[PDB]
Structure formats: structure tokens, C-alpha cells
Amino acid sequence: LKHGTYEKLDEDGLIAPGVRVSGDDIIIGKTTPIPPYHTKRDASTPLRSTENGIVDQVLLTTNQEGLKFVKVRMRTTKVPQIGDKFAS
Amino acid sequence: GVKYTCGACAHNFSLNKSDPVRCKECGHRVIYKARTKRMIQFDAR
């Protein structure tokens, strides 16, 4: 398993919008069965270690093959500080 | 269990994973998650 936390996930394997996420935070839980219980390997997608924000939208649908298809849009506010580049 | 929201008729229904991703009213295959039960705060800055 990943070194991040897993308490921010609901019972459907997805995170609800409105919860603040930080670096190394699981947002989409996914497992893969191991071919020959614990016979499963983790295949989740955590957040970037240099990105902290708040989950805004979660889309869940089906692709062309028929399996599940999830998308998580995280929003954040960037405030100009020392180091930002501007141009006339 | 988990509240959902349809992308066309905007119907609030709940599915238990095993149910397919579909709407129980207009049949739209595009749904979204609902707002979490936790309180969202801000510093107003």
C-alpha cells in the first residue's frame, strides 16, 4: 500500500468534493487482483507531493469498453508572492 | 449510501457500487458526486 492516508475515501472508492487534499493523498482507490485473502495489489493514484488544494468536481461514467471511468478536478488559489514572473 | 447528482435532469439518487452508472429518471450516463458532510471553512484572505 501507499504511504499516504486512506481515511479521505468514502465507501465507493472515490473522494467527495469539498475535502482538502495535500501531498501524497489518495483520492482514487483502485486494486488489481494478483494471479496465482490479500491477493490484491494497490493501483491507486495519489495527489502530487507539491500540490495542495480542495476537490471541486468528481465525474463518474462509463467509457467505450463499458468499464468505469472517473475524473477528479482539484482547485487551488495561487496568490502572487516573491518569485512570480510578470510581463508587460 | 453515497448521494449522487444527475447531469441532465438533476436527480438525487444513491447507488451501491454494484449498480451501474446510470440515471433512474432520464437515463443519463453522466453523474457527479454530492457535497461532503464535513464543514468547509475559509480564512477570507
Binding site: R20, S22, N52, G53, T76 | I40, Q41, F42, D43
Partner: peptide, 30 residues
């Protein structure tokens, strides 16, 4: 503790927190 308003984690003493439960925020007696 990672706060919700800013994007940073801070160290805080134990006597400066309030944990939630089934009725309000319970202090160290939780």
C-alpha cells in the same frame, strides 16, 4: 495538524486542541 484554510502543516501542543465526537467538541476527556 494540517489546517483547512491554509496549505501548511503546523505543530501544536496537546492542550491547544479540541477533538470532535458525538456531541460537540470534546477536549482531553475524550
Amino acid at each position: 495538524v494540517e489546517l483547512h484554510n491554509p496549505n501548511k502543516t503546523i505543530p501544536i501542543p496537546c492542550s491547544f486542541l479540541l477533538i470532535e465526537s458525538t456531541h460537540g467538541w470534546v477536549p482531553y476527556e475524550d
